Amino acid sequence: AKTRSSRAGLQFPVGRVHRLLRKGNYAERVGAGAPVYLAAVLEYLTAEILELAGNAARDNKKTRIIPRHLQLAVRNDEELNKLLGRVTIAQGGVLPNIQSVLLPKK
Template sequence: MFSYKMPGAAKRLSKTKRAGITMSVARIEKKLREGGYGKRVSPCASVFMATTLEYLCAEILDLAGTEAARVKNKLIHPRQVMLAIENDAELDILLRNVIIPGTGVRSQIHPLLLEEKKSSRKNQIA
């Protein structure tokens, strides 16, 4: 079959391609509407949220990749994701109450245990 394309017709682009990102804008817009977060949802809200989520994912995966390379792993495991979040100050504050399954326990040493006791030689001899 022969299909004729109009000479002046523009090619249709998805919202994701127009925004120049990878994460699906339409899917996030659908979830925003279904969630009932407001009576109306701006078209820009889903683009902004998709862009923000994509940036956060890229940042976390970049740090986790660095952590995996440090321990000489070729794959990124959940443990490296948790350690990457824990070692970054802003991400640690943002994701403080998030539990990632399969990561083990969070490494934390109580500050009182880190304090060195000042003891003099006179007290030890007596």
């Protein structure tokens, strides 16, 4: 008896997700492609941030991802930055950015 996450070819728990959709009270019933579909979507999005965040770390001379890295990954991507526009990442700081008119008169 192989698991559904395997059948769908995924890491995320198709089973845990299904259980959460029921106990979550979103509807009287829940199809089966749903927990699968939804599960796949969560995974993809996870990979998408972790990917960028790795980058952020590598290009920072580090191998261990930390909040700063997730913050730079998100705030530097138009798509993701919109998805989490009203979200605050603890310990992420802000993107280095100084308004031009405030730079030494030069």
